[PDB]
Design an enzyme around this catalytic site. Structure first.
Site, PDB file in Angstrom:
ATOM      1  CD  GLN B  11      -2.759   1.210   2.390  1.00  0.00           C
ATOM      2  OE1 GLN B  11      -3.535   0.250   2.455  1.00  0.00           O
ATOM      3  NE2 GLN B  11      -2.720   2.164   3.321  1.00  0.00           N
ATOM      4  CB  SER B 140       5.427   0.687   4.562  1.00  0.00           C
ATOM      5  OG  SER B 140       5.015  -0.674   4.590  1.00  0.00           O
ATOM      6  CG  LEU B 252      20.572   4.842 -10.092  1.00  0.00           C
ATOM      7  CD1 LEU B 252      19.844   3.501 -10.105  1.00  0.00           C
ATOM      8  CD2 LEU B 252      19.795   5.896  -9.255  1.00  0.00           C
ATOM      9  CD  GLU B 254      27.572  12.559  -9.521  1.00  0.00           C
ATOM     10  OE1 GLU B 254      27.114  12.452 -10.687  1.00  0.00           O
ATOM     11  OE2 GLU B 254      27.729  13.659  -8.930  1.00  0.00           O
TER      12      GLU B 254
HETATM   13  N1  LIG Z   1       3.186   7.984   4.110  1.00  0.00           N
HETATM   14  C1  LIG Z   1       2.370   6.932   3.974  1.00  0.00           C
HETATM   15  N2  LIG Z   1       2.420   5.932   4.857  1.00  0.00           N
HETATM   16  C2  LIG Z   1       1.588   4.922   4.539  1.00  0.00           C
HETATM   17  C3  LIG Z   1       0.687   4.852   3.492  1.00  0.00           C
HETATM   18  N3  LIG Z   1      -0.033   3.664   3.544  1.00  0.00           N
HETATM   19  C4  LIG Z   1       0.439   3.044   4.602  1.00  0.00           C
HETATM   20  N4  LIG Z   1       1.431   3.753   5.245  1.00  0.00           N
HETATM   21  C5  LIG Z   1       2.236   3.300   6.391  1.00  0.00           C
HETATM   22  O1  LIG Z   1       2.740   2.003   6.091  1.00  0.00           O
HETATM   23  C6  LIG Z   1       2.603   1.138   7.245  1.00  0.00           C
HETATM   24  C7  LIG Z   1       1.675  -0.022   6.933  1.00  0.00           C
HETATM   25  O2  LIG Z   1       2.209  -0.715   5.788  1.00  0.00           O
HETATM   26  P1  LIG Z   1       1.361  -0.845   4.446  1.00  0.00           P
HETATM   27  O3  LIG Z   1       2.160  -0.341   3.302  1.00  0.00           O
HETATM   28  O4  LIG Z   1      -0.013  -0.293   4.628  1.00  0.00           O
HETATM   29  O5  LIG Z   1       1.227  -2.435   4.353  1.00  0.00           O
HETATM   30  P2  LIG Z   1       1.525  -3.410   3.124  1.00  0.00           P
HETATM   31  O6  LIG Z   1       2.885  -3.186   2.589  1.00  0.00           O
HETATM   32  O7  LIG Z   1       0.421  -3.313   2.148  1.00  0.00           O
HETATM   33  O8  LIG Z   1       1.470  -4.820   3.872  1.00  0.00           O
HETATM   34  P3  LIG Z   1       0.230  -5.793   4.315  1.00  0.00           P
HETATM   35  O9  LIG Z   1      -1.030  -4.966   4.130  1.00  0.00           O
HETATM   36  O10 LIG Z   1       0.498  -6.157   5.759  1.00  0.00           O
HETATM   37  O11 LIG Z   1       0.300  -6.973   3.380  1.00  0.00           O
HETATM   38  C8  LIG Z   1       2.155   2.045   8.390  1.00  0.00           C
HETATM   39  O12 LIG Z   1       3.293   2.528   9.088  1.00  0.00           O
HETATM   40  C9  LIG Z   1       1.379   3.142   7.655  1.00  0.00           C
HETATM   41  O13 LIG Z   1       1.335   4.375   8.370  1.00  0.00           O
HETATM   42  C10 LIG Z   1       0.651   5.920   2.566  1.00  0.00           C
HETATM   43  O14 LIG Z   1      -0.027   5.978   1.543  1.00  0.00           O
HETATM   44  N5  LIG Z   1       1.537   6.933   2.889  1.00  0.00           N
HETATM   45 MG   LIG Z   2      -1.605  -3.977   2.411  1.00  0.00          MG
END
Ligand SMILES: Nc1nc2c(ncn2[C@@H]2O[C@H](COP(=O)(O)OP(=O)(O)OP(=O)(O)O)[C@@H](O)[C@H]2O)c(=O)[nH]1
Ligand SMILES: [Mg+2]
Ligand SMILES: Nc1nc2c(ncn2[C@@H]2O[C@H](COP(=O)(O)OP(=O)(O)OP(=O)(O)O)[C@@H](O)[C@H]2O)c(=O)[nH]1
Ligand SMILES: COc1ccc(/N=N\c2cc(OC)c(OC)c(OC)c2)cc1O
Ligand SMILES: [Ca+2]
Ligand SMILES: [Mg+2]
Lengths: 155, 436, 426
Positions: B11, B140, B252, B254
């Site tokens: 996500q 993330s 990259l 650099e």
């Molecule tokens: N800045 C920002 N942080 C995000 C966003 N979406 C999720 N997060 C952060 O990412 C973390 C959660 O990981 P996600 O990326 O949602 O999870 P995923 O990689 O899809 O993994 P699973 O859903 O567990 O399979 C938390 O710390 C959230 O605050 C976004 O669009 N922007």
């Molecule tokens: Mg997810």
């Protein structure tokens, strides 16, 4: 051996069978292997009429089994209100103590039989009686947060 | 011209990815269907923007990007949004069941069901390149997919593309917007297994971005949409040297030469100024000296830490807009007369400068005002060890009791992996202390 | 993660299960025939989690109805939504269990278990991405307790990777003065510790207490108690049924709420408390953490929260909820473990439940739950010491050792809660 048959009839609630066995010399105070008598079994299984019949034919109202249980402990544990009243009227020791230190009051309180608790208190049950762990029936009510029981014990 | 492939995982990586590619299209003049009228060479070319965009025979400019997620909801929004025609449909890969905020599901059990499909789709993009330099990986730390799948992907990319550079943009967890209680575990596990496979990584602390939105942009309760628009502005400033003509960070390799003195301490700090609210459309324009001074204020950092407590190993200033070089020289000269700027005794005390004379672009719907000059400072400072200490402490509090560990062990992971990852983090903290 | 297969077993399970279906169908704009009459796209966004889509756009609950007593099927059928259930999903036996756990788990219950598994199989096969199972049952009887736990184990065998969740009704002599209920409950708890991922503990002692002392109902009925149950069930399933910021599912709930595998017994809570036919964000957050609002008769101030999930429903400022939730954590900081950072999660859902403008549902994993287990353990021990009615169980094949093992396991569970209640961060 009519004693073993009388133990079975008392537990099973066979009123007619109890009368015939006694009329034929069956021991009203016979015990099973754990020391339970026909009166203990009729009081456990809620046979009020058998309890009354046995008490009019020499049953020891305060007989104890190997664990110190009296018929009054078992009727209070199982929650048979009418049998508790009949036993108390026939001389049951309201403060009898078993091998765990429990009195009939401790068992009625643990099981939540509040009407039996009231009856026992009215017949002189000791609120200071401690079990082998030092707990009174009041301690059991405070430890389990049973406010309804605590109110009755404080009356 | 040497191509760069961007990979967006989970996500956070996908949502940030979408905000970045929207901004890149606006900076280069690419419309949502891929058409670019200012591109005189149709069907090909070796212009600087071709590092990020390929060209079809019909004049379509297509991102060199892959979006991967173990569930489909997030990528489905990309497949139906304003930029649905921009991407290669086979470039958007989804599974049916996510990693449930569990690194072990992302890396070992669920992740293995799609890993070969992802590598085959990446190979199709790599085969289209004449001189692939490497990869930009967005993810993330906290998610199961972002942590676990990314580690598995980075391990495979190191085997299949041995001499290619790999750069990360990683989202470091914050309490205010977190998803899961086990995010410190996922963060430490992914850091340990990716450390030897990543050449340079830019951490973005959600708490730092959240505070900037509240303080500078007057946003009461920032959502991911507000965080991601600011993050995309910063990411664009970091990658502009790869997509435009310039003399600093042009490839990259650099980035590693300028910012990474030793392989393990590869986490530069980014600072960006000025961040001004769109409701202040008549704001007084800030000079080169004012924006440059703002780079040394902790409140403008992408990671919460204090560079006054640490020492610098490298410092790069990347300007965009109406910036006269002699004004930069003078601002830097003034900044050198400051007690809170200390370099390690083994690095030259210099500041590398790059200027792109086009001002930054704002996205319609954004929270930022247009500005005539902006700066992004990238530094390698030992004060970033404070971010690792904060994370390691949360890990230790739970791990001492083995809280939640059964979820990881139940998903094809050995408990010894937690101690090995933590020991590597203790060594990382000592690497920063040994430098200063 | 989408579909959930719901099973309801025994009298209590079927009664609370029917109330669940009535309450959530109203929230999703679903009428007793299965037709949609709602006014919001949000009601159908995640409808596939609890309902199958059929001919004429008719939404049919993914629900299997089980009971050894055949009279339960007619009481379900005569309810308002009694015709909504799939006719082939009713699996009923010839004779009840007579409040005997051994009959439900080993003899009559074991004869009808393969029939229910065929129905679970057909329902599961028609799921695109099954997330798991939810079972409603009491622990004090024979069918929901004995057969329900047997069913959990067999489903756990065929579908090991899926989540198993239960809504388990705890016995109390205030509602049912049947002395074999602590035996049935203890034997069931031994099964639940091993074979479920998450269990909501809905205590009849607590339900009675709320109705009597808080709601002023002198003679609480099952309809009064079940009103509190359906409200709790609607609240704890909100994040599974509505989109919200979090794409919630049963597995993400388990990973974030269960730090130790055996400690998966939750204490639910609800605010405001209401009776049949009869608040600001600061008030809602306060009521939500009060002993008077808990559905398990435990005082949370006697223990420590390991993890908490809170769901607020209605129109309200999310910044206000964030502020007030941070506030409760500061003033009641001694009631949270300090070694699980950020252990309180908050969700806000736009659609409030029926008759309410604002509501809050609490899901706590609290070490104070040991008070509930100690209450049942003490009653089990009082009966067990005297071997009262043991022949009713050993006569159905049960070994007296199974009672001993169940008692030892529940006492161990109470010790494990005490262990984490006393643990410090250092
Ligand atoms: N800045 C920002 N942080 C995000 C966003 N979406 C999720 N997060 C952060 O990412 C973390 C959660 O990981 P996600 O990326 O949602 O999870 P995923 O990689 O899809 O993994 P699973 O859903 O567990 O399979 C938390 O710390 C959230 O605050 C976004 O669009 N922007
Ligand atoms: Mg997810
Ligand atoms: N809250 C609540 N408790 C109920 C309800 N129906 C029964 N109970 C409780 O459930 C326990 C008895 O279990 P039942 O569900 O009636 O029994 P069963 O599972 O059908 O088992 P058998 O009838 O013995 O085969 C007692 O503790 C009752 O107080 C109900 O509608 N609501
Ligand atoms: C203590 O921290 C956490 C708790 C659970 C989490 N995720 N799962 C869900 C969240 C829910 O409400 C907040 C919910 O409603 C109860 C839900 O329904 C099944 C799942 C995430 C957390 O970080
Ligand atoms: Ca071209
Ligand atoms: Mg029944």
């Amino acid at each position: 051996d009519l004693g073993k048959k009388l133990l079975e009839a008392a537990r099973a609630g066979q009123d007619d069978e109890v009368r015939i066995l006694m009329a034929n010399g069956a021991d009203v105070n016979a015990t099973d292997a754990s020391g339970l008598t026909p009166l203990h079994l009729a009081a456990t299984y809620g046979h009020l009429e058998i309890v009354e019949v046995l008490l009019k034919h020499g049953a020891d109202v305060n007989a104890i089994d190997i664990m110190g249980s009296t018929p009054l402990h078992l009727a209070a544990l199982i929650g048979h209100l009418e049998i508790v009243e009949v036993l108390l009227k026939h001389g049951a020791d309201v403060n009898a103590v078993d091998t765990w230190g429990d009195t009939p009051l401790h068992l009625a309180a643990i099981m939540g039989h509040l009407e039996i608790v009231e009856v026992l208190l009215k017949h002189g049950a000791d609120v200071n009686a401690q079990d082998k762990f030092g707990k009174t029936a009041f301690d059991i009510s405070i430890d389990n947060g049973n406010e309804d029981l605590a109110e009755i014990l404080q009356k | 011209m040497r191509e760069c492939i961007s990979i967006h995982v989970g996500q956070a990586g996908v949502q940030i990815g979408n905000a970045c590619w929207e901004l890149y299209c606006l900076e280069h003049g690419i419309q949502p269907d891929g058409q670019m009228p200012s591109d005189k060479t149709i069907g090909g070319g070796d212009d600087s923007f071709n590092t990020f965009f390929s060209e079809t025979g019909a004049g379509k400019h297509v991102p060199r990007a892959v979006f991967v997620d173990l569930e489909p909801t997030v990528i489905d929004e990309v497949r139906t949004g304003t930029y649905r025609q921009l991407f290669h449909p086979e470039q958007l890969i989804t599974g049916k069941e996510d990693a449930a905020n569990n690194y072990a599901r992302g890396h070992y059990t669920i992740g293995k069901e799609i890993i070969d499909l992802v590598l085959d789709r990446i190979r199709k993009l790599a085969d289209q390149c004449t001189g692939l330099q490497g990869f930009l990986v967005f993810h993330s730390f906290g998610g199961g997919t972002g942590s676990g799948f990314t580690s598995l992907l980075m391990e495979r990319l190191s085997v299949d593309y041995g001499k290619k550079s790999k750069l990360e943009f990683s989202i470091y967890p914050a309490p205010q917007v977190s998803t899961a209680v086990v995010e410190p575990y996922n963060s430490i596990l992914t850091t340990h297994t990716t450390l030897e496979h990543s050449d340079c990584a830019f951490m973005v602390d959600n708490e730092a971005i959240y505070d900037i939105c509240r303080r500078n942009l007057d946003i009461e309760r920032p959502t991911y949409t507000n965080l991601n628009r600011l993050i995309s502005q910063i990411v664009s400033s970091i990658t502009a040297s790869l997509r435009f003509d310039g003399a600093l960070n042009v490839d990259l390799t650099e980035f590693q030469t300028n910012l990474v003195p030793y392989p393990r301490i590869h986490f530069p700090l980014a600072t960006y100024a000025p961040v001004i609210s769109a409701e202040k459309a008549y704001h007084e324009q800030l000079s080169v000296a004012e924006i440059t001074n703002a780079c040394f204020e902790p409140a403008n950092q992408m990671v919460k830490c204090d560079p006054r407590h640490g020492k610098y190993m490298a410092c790069c200033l990347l300007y965009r807009g109406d910036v006269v070089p002699k004004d930069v020289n003078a601002a830097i000269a003034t900044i050198k007369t400051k007690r809170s700027i200390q370099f390690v005794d083994w690095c030259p005390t210099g500041f590398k400068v790059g200027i792109n004379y086009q001002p930054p672009t704002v996205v319609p719907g954004g929270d930022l005002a247009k500005v005539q000059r902006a700066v992004c400072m990238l530094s390698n400072t030992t004060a970033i060890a404070e971010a690792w200490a904060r994370l390691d402490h949360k890990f230790d509090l739970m791990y001492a009791k083995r809280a939640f560990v059964h979820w990881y062990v139940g998903e094809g992971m050995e408990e010894g992996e937690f101690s090995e990852a933590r020991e590597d983090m203790a060594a990382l903290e000592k690497d920063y202390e040994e430098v200063g | 993660m989408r579909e959930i297969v719901h099973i309801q077993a025994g009298q209590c399970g079927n009664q609370i299960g029917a109330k669940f279906w009535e309450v959530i169908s109203d929230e999703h704009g679903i009428d007793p025939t299965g037709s949609y009459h709602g006014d919001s796209d949000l009601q159908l966004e995640r409808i596939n989690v609890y309902y199958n889509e059929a001919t004429g756009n008719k939404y049919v609950p993914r629900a299997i109805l089980v009971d050894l007593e055949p009279g339960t099927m007619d009481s379900v059928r005569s309810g308002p939504f009694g015709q909504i259930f799939r006719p082939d999903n009713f699996v009923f036996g010839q004779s009840g269990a007579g409040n005997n756990w051994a009959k439900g788990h080993y003899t009559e219950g074991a004869e009808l278990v393969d029939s229910v598994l065929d129905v679970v199989r057909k329902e599961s096969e028609s799921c695109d991405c099954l997330q798991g199972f939810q079972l409603t049952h009491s622990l004090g009887g024979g069918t929901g307790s004995g057969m329900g736990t047997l069913l959990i184990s067999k489903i756990r065998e065929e579908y090991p990777d899926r989540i198993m969740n239960t809504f388990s009704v705890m016995p109390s002599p205030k509602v049912s003065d049947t002395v074999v209920e602590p035996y049935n409950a203890t034997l069931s708890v031994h099964q639940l510790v091993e074979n479920t991922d998450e269990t909501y503990c809905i205590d009849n002692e607590a339900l009675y207490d709320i109705c009597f002392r808080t709601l002023k109902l002198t003679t609480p009925t099952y309809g009064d108690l079940n009103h509190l149950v359906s409200a709790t069930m609607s609240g704890v399933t909100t994040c599974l049924r509505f989109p919200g910021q979090l794409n919630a599912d049963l597995r993400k709930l388990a990973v974030n709420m269960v730090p130790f595998p055996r400690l998966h017994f939750f204490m639910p809570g609800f605010a405001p408390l209401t009776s049949r036919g009869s608040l600001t964000v600061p008030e809602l957050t306060q009521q939500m953490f009060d002993s008077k609002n808990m559905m398990a008769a435990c005082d949370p101030r006697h223990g420590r929260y390991l993890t908490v999930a809170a769901i607020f429903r209605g129109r309200m400022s999310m910044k206000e909820v964030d502020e007030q939730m941070l506030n409760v954590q500061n003033k009641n900081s001694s009631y949270f473990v300090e070694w699980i950072p950020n252990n309180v999660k908050t969700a806000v859902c736009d659609i409030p439940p029926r008759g309410l403008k604002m509501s809050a549902t609490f899901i706590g994993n609290s070490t104070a739950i040991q008070e509930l287990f100690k209450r049942i353990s003490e009653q089990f021990t009082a009966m067990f010491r005297r071997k009262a009615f043991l022949h009713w169980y050993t006569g159905e094949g049960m070994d007296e050792m199974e009672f001993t093992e169940a008692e030892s396991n529940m006492n161990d569970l109470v010790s494990e809660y005490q262990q984490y209640q006393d643990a410090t961060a250092d």
